[PDB]
Structure formats: C-alpha cells, structure tokens
Amino acid sequence: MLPGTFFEVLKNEGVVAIATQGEDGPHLVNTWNSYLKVLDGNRIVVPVGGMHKTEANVARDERVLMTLGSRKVAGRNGPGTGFLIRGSAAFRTDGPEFEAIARFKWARAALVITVVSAEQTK
C-alpha cells in the first residue's frame, strides 16, 4: 500500500521518527530515510542498535507510528511532503528480515514494521 511518492521520499535523506506507547506517555526514537529497507508484503525494516525502551514498549503494544518526509519531493500544495505510517512492529534477530539490515555492524536486531496504512500528510 506504500505509494510511489513514499519511495521518492526514500531517495532523499531525512530523519525518520518512530512512536510507541510507553508506560507513562508516548516514546519517540529515530532512524534515517536512507536506512529503511522496504520488503514485499508492506514491510519496512529498520536497523536496531539501541531502541531498548522502544522494544520493551512494542512487547506490550505492537502498534507504532512512523513519520518521514523530504523537502525535495513535491507535496499537494507546494514543495516538500511526508507520510504518517501506522503498522505493527516486531523485532527480529535472525532470518531474512534481520539479514536485510545486517550490513550495519552495530545492529543487534531488525525492527520490522508491517504497514496497515500510509497517509501523505502534505
């Protein structure tokens, strides 16, 4: 369901934000546009170095939100666009999904987000 415009955004660098539900409010961490690996089946894979609090939150509630964008991709009303992604998260430490980001020597896991919806918010 990820649209072409989303893939255009990925051709440009930027800060990706991933929100999870914490015990006393939301938690928010980041990665880079260039680090995302998209696999068939609506899967976005993120290389995990830290994200220990994020992983703990996902264990209690798999639902996460992700935003990303680029000023270099045209939006509906002018330069720049971005997306709000909603999906379920899981942490993999072996298999094809981990190998997808194993190139990062510091990776301890792969954060796999299965997309349920993708909205272009600009």
71 in helix, strand or coil? coil
Separation of alpha carbons 10 and 33, rounded Å: 6
Binding positions for ligand FMN, 35-54, rule CB under 6 A: 35, 47-54
Q: Contact with its own copies (CB under 8 A): which of 5, 8, 29, 75? A: 29
Encode 46-61 in three state secondary structure. EEECCCHHHHHHHHHC
Residue 66, contacted partner among its own copies, ligand FMN, none, CB below 5-8 A by kind? its own copies
Q: Is 20 in the site for its own copies (CB under 8 A)?
A: yes
The residue number with the shortest CB distance to ligand FMN is 82
Q: Contact with its own copies (CB under 8 A): which of 3, 7, 13, 103? A: 13
Q: How far is the CB of 96 from its own copies (least distance, A)?
A: 27
Pick the closest to residue 1 from 87, 99, 68 (CA basis). Answer: 87
